[PDB]
Amino acid sequence: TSILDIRQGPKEPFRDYVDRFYKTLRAEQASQEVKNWMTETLLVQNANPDCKTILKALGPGATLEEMMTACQGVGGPGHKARVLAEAMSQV
Amino acid sequence: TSILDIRQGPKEPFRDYVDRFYKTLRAEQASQEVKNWMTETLLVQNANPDCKTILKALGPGATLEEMMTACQGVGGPGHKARVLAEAMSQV
Amino acid sequence: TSILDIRQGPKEPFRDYVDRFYKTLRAEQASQEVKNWMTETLLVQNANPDCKTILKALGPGATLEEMMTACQGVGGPGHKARVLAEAMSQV
Amino acid sequence: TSILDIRQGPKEPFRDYVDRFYKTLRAEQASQEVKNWMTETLLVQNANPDCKTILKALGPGATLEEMMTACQGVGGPGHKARVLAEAMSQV
Amino acid sequence: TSILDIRQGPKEPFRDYVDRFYKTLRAEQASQEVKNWMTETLLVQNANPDCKTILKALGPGATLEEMMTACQGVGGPGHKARVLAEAMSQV
Amino acid sequence: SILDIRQGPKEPFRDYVDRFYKTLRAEQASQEVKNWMTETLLVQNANPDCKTILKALGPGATLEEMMTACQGVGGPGHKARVLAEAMSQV
To answer: What are the residue boundaries of the Retroviral nucleocapsid Gag protein p24 C-terminal domain, all occurrences included (chains A, B, C, D, E) (predicted)?
Structure first.
């Protein structure tokens, strides 16, 4: 297992991916400074398109509590419907 | 294992989450006064948008059994359609 | 475990909830006469809206066998579509 | 369990339901003549609306191997879509 | 078990059914000519409507790898949509 | 057999590549053959939706370039975009 191979599934809840991310990151042989830098880069890059789009609107300076509260709706009826509703207006 | 890490999944029924909440809350080393304050605060805060939207409409003073009965529709055919139908009107 | 904590999930089939209900009702330490009263009251109240909507339409004089035959369509293609179509007409 | 409690779930394949039906019928204490009559009556009566709609259209005289082939389409994209389309025109 | 009872589920991938088909065929007491004739006959008949629809367009002569590649799309986002779109146009 | 590994219609790409490489590490072959297997089967035995995305990426792309393009398949945005293009296509 490698922290770089950790990617968020398309139907995986955000709370679990960050769980495996932090579950595996606590094992990667590196310094705490590197592990914090990993968090700043990987976590937002290896997320799925739906979650990444939500995070790009948050701007910088957000915390997990700010991310996860914004992503635990992804995969929910309001999200899936809103996404499916915006597409019909796009087409 | 921390009570603050307990978050409702987007496809998780409200019942399970409250069970994990109280199953996890039963382990947190704290005073009973603080644990009651947790329930009033986190339980509805760490929920997903669909339930929090329903719970925000109940207002305050609502009882557990009073809420759990209002969220067991989320994820059902009647709900998903009502969500999907109101969304088409939103756009 | 308590008879009052047994509630049907939003995506759970009826045939199972009644199984959990009667599996727990046979465990509650109480008299047989009161347990029948539980059946008449809890079973239809602690169900989800979709099944409750169909059971309320049967009226009084049901026999459980008449209910379960009326709810095994909930969650199926015919139902989910029928529900989604009636909502499309509203908005 | 009792053969009369065997009911097809809304999301259960017909092949599985008929599997449990015969799995239980081989245990119910009854005569071969009694068990044959059960097959003719319950199997099509305890089925879900989607399958019963297909089997009611076949009429009588239909054979097992002739029914299974008519119900293993239920739950497929063509079915759910065809059903999901006819309802939109019905409402 | 029996090779004649092997039927493709409505929500089952093809590669699994062909897996179970050959899993059972390797046990059926028969001649190699019988098993080959089984393969040419049952495999396409006991498939579900969606897959049988695609195979009927391939005609005869097609090879396994030639078929399997045409059926691993059934149940995917592109398939379910194409099926749902042709049905909306049919009515 | 490495040839029998195919991506299901509802299987994530990251899982199929796992099973793909899980078998390839056992197949008795030369390193050159296993690399050629990777270059050929991996993109061919995937499902239409993922293959549709990979056919658009062209050649010269690495796994990290693919996996990052297929983890949207099966997500709400994907099924919706696909379902929206189909309504206009038909």
So the answer is: 1-70
